[PDB]
Design a protein around this ligand. Structure first.
Ligand SMILES: [Cl-]
Ligand SMILES: [Zn+2]
Length: 213
């Protein structure tokens, strides 16, 4: 996690340089982008004078970009937003199921994960978040914390054995979350989503996002 010292020195280093030379997979860019988009640092960076710098502006817009891996029509996977779990979460979960191996689906009450593929040692949790509720639209950091909770759950998992079937963490190499969001998700919500995704990486959890319109 980036300290003010580190952020200040990083900004100084990039003054008057071409920003296209920035490796957006480098650990330092990643840390700075997280630092600079975390809104508990906004007034800090603004009134501190770091926001006038191109790299700081570039970090913010980078974290606000749409990082959805796919876009799917709700009407084609039997899904609706905001009409209750049966028409939202469950069709989402079945749709993910059709794209994973035929052996992968875990029993209904299995804890935390929904799918597991032994061929790749990949355990998958399936989630949907309606970003268009009055709460999520008007309350900063709720989208973030919701995804964070899912991430920590997935990383916390050690072992679950239910009615003759068990999965242990020694057999989980990849932890993934397949997250669905509505396509009218806002720029500010995308910042939260990307911060959550990056936090996912540090916990060894891959968060993949599909926009459902
Ligand atoms: Cl456990
Ligand atoms: Zn489930």
């Amino acid at each position: 996690v980036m300290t003010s010292d580190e952020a200040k020195a990083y900004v100084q280093k990039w003054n008057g340089r071409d920003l296209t030379k920035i490796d957006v997979n480098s650990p330092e860019w990643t840390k700075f982008a997280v630092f600079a988009s975390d809104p508990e640092n906004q007034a800090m960076l603004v009134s501190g004078g770091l926001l006038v710098k191109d790299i700081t502006k570039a970090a913010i817009s980078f974290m606000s970009r749409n990082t959805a891996t796919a876009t799917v029509n709700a009407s084609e996977i039997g899904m609706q937003w905001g009409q209750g779990n049966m028409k939202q979460g469950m069709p989402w979960e079945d749709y993910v199921g059709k794209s994973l191996p035929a052996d992968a689906r875990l029993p209904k009450n299995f804890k935390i994960f929904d799918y597991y593929d032994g061929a790749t040692k990949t355990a998958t949790s399936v989630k949907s978040i309606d970003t268009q509720t009055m709460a999520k639209l008007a309350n900063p950091n709720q989208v973030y914390s919701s995804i964070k909770g899912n991430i920590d759950a997935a990383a916390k998992f050690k072992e679950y054995a239910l009615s003759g079937r068990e999965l242990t963490s020694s057999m989980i190499s990849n932890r993934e979350i397949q997250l669905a969001i509505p396509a009218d998700t806002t720029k500010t919500q995308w910042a939260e989503i990307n911060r959550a995704i990056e936090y996912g990486k540090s916990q060894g959890v891959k968060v993949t996002v599909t926009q459902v319109k």
